[PDB]
């Protein structure tokens, strides 16, 4: 069906978790919160799903993000422990909650690394190109 395609997004959860290793686990949730939220600031189709979850829960579309960010972080720490299958099952809930494609989550992780460095205003060692 789509398990094989979900494996491709789960590779980024392995890559990102070793990229952020040695930080505080609660901070990862706060970095993911704004990183997953940026997709709704960039696209109305994500933001209208934030409204559906918040209206089902009786809250604001900003408040469901705290719960959405846990799901991704639990996929990263599982992927760091070598558990790619529970990481896949943990992304299934996150991509389904926002109604998004695994390649769109593969885009979200690329915002996560761009906002991680912004806590210090640093830049990545992108010296493999140009």
Q: Obtained via which technique?
A: NMR
Nearest to 16 by CA among 37, 31, 26: 31
Torsion angle, CA of 31/36/37/40, rounded to 10 degrees? Answer: 160
Assess if residue 83 is contained within a domain.
Answer: yes
Per the CB < 8 A criterion, the answer to whether 84 and 75 are in contact is no
Q: Establish if 62 belongs to a structural domain.
A: yes
Question: How many other C-beta atoms lie within 10 A of the C-beta of residue 98?
Answer: 22
> How many structural domains compose the chain?
1
7, two tokens: 């494996």
Give the domain extent around 102. 3-119
Residue 7 lies in a domain: yes
CA distance to 35, 67, 89, 98, per residue, from 54 (Å) = 18, 11, 23, 11
Residue 45 included in any domain: yes
Whether 61 is covered by a domain: the verdict is yes
Which of 11, 2, 16, 8 has its CA nearest to residue 109? 16
In angstroms, rounded to a whole number, what is the distance separating the alpha carbons of residues 25 and 103?
25
User: What's the 3-state SS for the chain?
Assistant: CCHHHHHHHHHHHHHHHHHCCCCCHHHHHHHHHHHHHHHHHHCHHHHHHHHHHHHHHCCCCCCCHHHHHHHHHHHHHHHHCCCHHHHHHHHHHHHHHCCCCHHHHHHHHHHHHHHHHHHCCCCCCCCCCC
How far apart are alpha carbons 39 and 68 in whole angstroms? 13
Q: What is the largest distance, in Å, between two alpha-carbon atoms of the chain?
A: 50
Examine residue 127 and state whether it is found in any structural domain, yes or no. no
| Residue 84 within a domain | yes
Q: Does any domain span residue 16?
A: yes
């Amino acid at each position: 069906g789509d398990e094989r395609k979900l494996e491709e997004v789960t590779e980024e959860m392995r890559k990102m978790a070793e990229n952020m290793d040695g930080q505080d686990p609660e901070k990862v949730k706060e970095i993911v919160r704004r990183a997953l939220q940026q997709m709704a600031n960039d696209n109305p189709e994500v933001s209208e799903q934030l409204r559906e979850l918040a209206k089902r829960k009786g809250t604001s579309p900003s408040e469901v993000i705290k719960d959405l960010a846990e799901q991704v972080w639990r996929a990263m720490e599982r992927a760091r422990e070598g558990d790619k299958d529970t990481a896949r099952e943990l992304i299934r809930k996150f991509a389904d909650d926002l109604g998004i494609s695994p390649e769109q989550v593969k885009k979200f992780i690329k915002i996560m690394r761009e906002v991680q460095r912004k806590e210090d205003g640093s830049l990545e060692h992108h010296h493999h190109h140009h």
